[PDB]
């Protein structure tokens, strides 16, 4: 029933929500590059 | 079901806005010394507040942590607050909505706010996967039924 | 009172980003003596492109126009593309997902990138009030749909 | 319009969402100027 | 640390990045009770640190206070850090770089970041307008021009 | 004795940095105005 | 703001804004699958337009053409226009301050506008190293014909 | 080329220095083993 919710009222821990296991397959691990370090 | 008339139940957003934004990178100059292998945490939290009669506020606390082992790279906590002026609801179904559906409204805007903070700190975009707990809950209710019925064109 | 479609739906986000950005202020010097009364309106235009099987790029063009009559205030447009790996989507739930929800995932990014461009053009930027299509639709409908959301709980 | 997927239509359950329209009032703060940079 | 002001000098960027963000809107819902602009007022603050020999890290902190009537609207603050390689510069030369040049590099990024966070809480534009302190400096210590005779050129 | 160029402990950040207080001449109006949200 | 010709050397910075911005990502998700460093072509160009006596807008075109392998990575351009109250100017000093110093002010703001669009396209931060091309040419002015008022003005 | 002490017409550029450009560094690969939600 219903179409909405207000208030808070944590009466009972309904169900389980373990979220997303935020673990992937790496990224740019820096790697010693260069941009040419000196202006003037 | 000859009762084709709405009861006191209605879902209505009055305003979505960030009540707090916090990006911390205390080891930001220090990160260059460390290798980029980020272990990402998501700490999910919410709060409610009464602004008026039937007028409530649900604030979403998303916390986004990038830890390089025992060395923090950055942190991103955004309180994406949303006013909802609703009534007529109770039971276990209200817990489903304020616990999942109402912060789900706020979650694209929270995700973005963080993602932009991350990229402004010259770090790579982090796309937080949305958890479709709503469908998981409906599987218990009646599996799934989606009978669409157009009538109310535009307003 | 409940026609089961048994729609599974598996939503996974891959990557979000600006494909295209632009800011047009033709009258940019001239704005020093203009009138402050524009129709600041955002335009959600929906396109897509197949990258692979079950991998589809949704490109939502948001365009914020600002016009004072014959004198134009400014124009800004950000075509926010988002890679989404989806399968199992069916019934009304598919049209509710990639025809509202997935563009709404892209909406805050595009909106903020416009708010960026307007700030750069030294005009009164803001992140404009979220156009809550979902709230209106679920409120509207015609029929009561059915008694699918009818169940207590266990633990 | 059309489809860029195995399944995609969006005509009947695809209603027109609001595109907003906020009125900017009338006349901007331009005469003396108190937000610009004058000092030199 | 030399004090004479007559050396070849040298500058270089290694990295620009946001270290800290804050947008704290305490009376964020009360913006719906307050029908008028918040008084949004700037603050500049100078925080820096040394990573290594000739390798500094200058943090530009722009703090922002805003208030609706007799009440606070929001309170924003950004810390745009930047690793700058400085050598040769001394006394007034170095005070001119760390106190005008390095700020004016980080300053667009601090501006864009604040004015974004402000608008995320559905508030209007406030980006800090740029000041040519260098133009004042050239007259302050009297640099003059290359005194001789002017050219026309004909083409 | 002693290497590196000069270094500093932040001695007097420039010959002062003055800025503007606040201006723009903005407003709200929930009655079809701006920066508002007159209910969706 | 308010400046008349009845004055000696003057340099006020009235207003800095973006007139034109563009960002394009043609092979945008293809480039995500193509993990290398985008080689960017930075094209320097300048413009001018008189707004009043001793008041003009100098526009800085910073064009960016990024490529990966044998294909395009992304395109970008920002025409950062800026209003400057200039007077007490003559010869190679006038030409230099117009063609070097005025774009040098606009350059942190042009650079940042691009840096943001690159990070919004979820590509690596593009910050052009701050090269004082003004000071480089500045020495050549007082070693040629240019700038009137005869030398030997000293004891 | 032709100009006066006061102002000019933009007939051509002149003050155009070659910018330092980027070099072969590395800062790509923005995930690849993207974590799933569950099934829903």
From Swiss-Prot, chains A, D, F, H:
User: In which domain of life is the source organism classified?
Assistant: Bacteria
Name its cellular compartments. Periplasm
Disulfide bridges in this chain: none
Q: Oligomeric state and partners?
A: The complex is composed of two ATP-binding proteins (MalK), two transmembrane proteins (MalG and MalF) and a solute-binding protein (MalE).
Give the family this protein belongs to, as stated in its UniProt record.
Answer: Belongs to the bacterial solute-binding protein 1 family.
Its biological purpose is as follows:
Part of the ABC transporter complex MalEFGK involved in maltose/maltodextrin import. Binds maltose and higher maltodextrins.
Spell out the protein name for this chain. Maltose/maltodextrin-binding periplasmic protein
UniProt source species: Escherichia coli O157:H7
Gene that this sequence comes from: malE
Which residues of the entire protein appear here: the answer is 168 to 207 of 396
Curated annotation (Swiss-Prot), chains B, C, E, G:
Pull one GO CC term from this UniProt entry.
cytoplasm
Q: According to the UniProt record, which cysteines are disulfide-bonded?
A: none
GO biological process per UniProt: protein folding; protein tetramerization; protein transport
Which cell locations does it reside in? Cytoplasm
Q: Which UniProt keywords apply?
A: Chaperone, Cytoplasm, Protein transport, Translocation, Transport
Q: Where does the UniProt entry say this protein principally localizes?
A: cytoplasm
MF terms (GO), sorted A to Z = unfolded protein binding
Going by the entry's taxonomy, the superkingdom of the source organism is recorded as Bacteria
This protein's record includes keyword Chaperone? yes
CDD domains, alphabetized: Translocase_SecB (cd00557)
Q: What does this protein do?
A: One of the proteins required for the normal export of preproteins out of the cell cytoplasm. It is a molecular chaperone that binds to a subset of precursor proteins, maintaining them in a translocation-competent state. It also specifically binds to its receptor SecA.
The record's family statement is: Belongs to the SecB family.
Q: Indicate the quaternary assembly.
A: Homotetramer, a dimer of dimers. One homotetramer interacts with 1 SecA dimer.
Q: What is this protein called?
A: Protein-export protein SecB
Annotated source species:
Escherichia coli O157:H7
